[PDB]
Design a protein around this nucleic acid. Structure first.
Length: 108
RNA sequence: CUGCGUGAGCGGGGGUGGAGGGGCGAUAUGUGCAGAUCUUGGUAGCAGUAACAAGGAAAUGAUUUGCGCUGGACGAGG
């Protein structure tokens, strides 16, 4: 396994078609942002909250309210909570790509 | 809580209560309740059950984006 924290930025691919199956086709887009937040908390074995950028949010709604695009490449980073002062959050952003081939997990 | 009476009922003791209450003889009665699909008021079980609501999101939301189709005027009525 690989659970990663302490001031870094990881890059990662998520399979939306996979994590959103078992959901009715009228509800895959209406609940897609909430299914993605659960799977980042599982990937890193965390408990803190997740924050989604306005470009990630806009990209998950770009096939209408019935379709849900296939894959997404994201960049995760941990920093301080803007609502409390002692807790952290996982902040996620969008990375634009033309292919998903040979793309592994990266750390900088 | 306790004594007496075959019984209907009648006494005493300790708390509570804060102003009146009885015995005996004759007399006047709107004079004794378990029931009337009785009258009025209060309360259980059923049961936290049936039914109804939880509208797409973005730490923030005068900014960004997703969905629905009545929209604007005169009279009656308010």
């Amino acid at each position: 396994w690989s659970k990663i924290e302490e001031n870094q930025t990881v890059e990662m691919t998520v399979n939306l078609r996979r994590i959103c199956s078992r959901l009715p086709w009228t509800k895959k887009a209406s609940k897609v942002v909430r299914m993605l937040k659960r799977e980042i908390q599982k990937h890193f074995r965390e408990e803190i909250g997740v924050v989604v950028t306005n470009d990630l949010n806009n990209f998950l709604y770009s096939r209408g309210i019935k379709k849900i695009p296939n894959k997404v490449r994201v960049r995760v980073t941990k920093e301080t909570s803007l609502k409390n002062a002692e807790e952290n959050v996982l902040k996620t952003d969008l990375v634009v790509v033309g292919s998903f081939k040979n793309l592994k997990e990266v750390i900088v």
